[PDB]
Design a protein around this nucleic acid. Structure first.
Ligand SMILES: [Mg+2]
Ligand SMILES: [Mg+2]
Ligand SMILES: [Mg+2]
Ligand SMILES: [Mg+2]
Ligand SMILES: [Mg+2]
Ligand SMILES: [Mg+2]
Length: 137
RNA sequence: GUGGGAUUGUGAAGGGAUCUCGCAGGUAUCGUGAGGGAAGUAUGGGGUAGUACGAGAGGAACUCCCAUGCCGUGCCUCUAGUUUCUGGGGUU
């Protein structure tokens, strides 16, 4: 689909990363980590922090990395999370780290390589990431 | 009428009068429903369709399917949390 609207095409996934979380960057663009600012498609509720999960597009900024990428607001897609989630076939699964990839507002991926596995929930929603994924788990 | 009690404060025994109360319900189920409360609410995707309209740039919507947010009422098969079963083990 390659669109920021994912709730209507993705099953429920337990939320993992509230605002202020720092995750690894799995691309080869020179960024080393990403800081979560907000989540696309979040409707508000008093006192509740926005929280992201697999396959979500977030607004972020680079804290450690090449100076040409820092002090700006960018778009990223979450591909790995440590919070365990349950699939409809009854399997509970989780990763070892939290990782995302910097992309375009239209979902086009900046960079040309991905390190580590990529979740199927993200691969199905974003095809270019699925193209560059070394392994889809 | 019947059965119980009791009369005003100064000793005991008998009678009389008067007054008050009781004289039919108890126990156990299944239901009715006047009146009162009152709740569900939003977004996206597929398809319609690169269609209608428009010189062109551009660019919709309903029946019908599939998901999600908030709210509400429960539940403990799975996953996670909690241990004064101090359960089993280890260690100063
Ligand atoms: Mg507050
Ligand atoms: Mg009524
Ligand atoms: Mg609903
Ligand atoms: Mg347990
Ligand atoms: Mg338990
Ligand atoms: Mg001991």
């Amino acid at each position: 689909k390659d669109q920021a609207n994912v709730k209507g095409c993705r099953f429920r996934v337990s939320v993992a990363l509230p605002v202020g979380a720092v995750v690894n960057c799995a691309d080869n663009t020179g960024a080393k980590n990403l800081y979560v600012i907000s989540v696309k498609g979040y409707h508000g509720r008093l006192n509740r922090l926005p929280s992201a999960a697999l396959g979500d597009m977030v607004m972020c900024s680079v804290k450690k990395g090449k100076p040409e990428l820092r002090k700006k607001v960018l778009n990223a897609v979450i591909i790995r999370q440590r919070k365990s989630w349950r699939r409809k076939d009854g399997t509970v699964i989780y990763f070892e780290d939290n990782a995302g990839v910097i992309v375009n507002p239209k979902g086009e991926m900046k960079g040309s390589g991905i390190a580590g596995p990529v979740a199927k929930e993200s691969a199905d929603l974003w095809p270019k990431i699925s193209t560059h994924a070394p392994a889809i788990v």
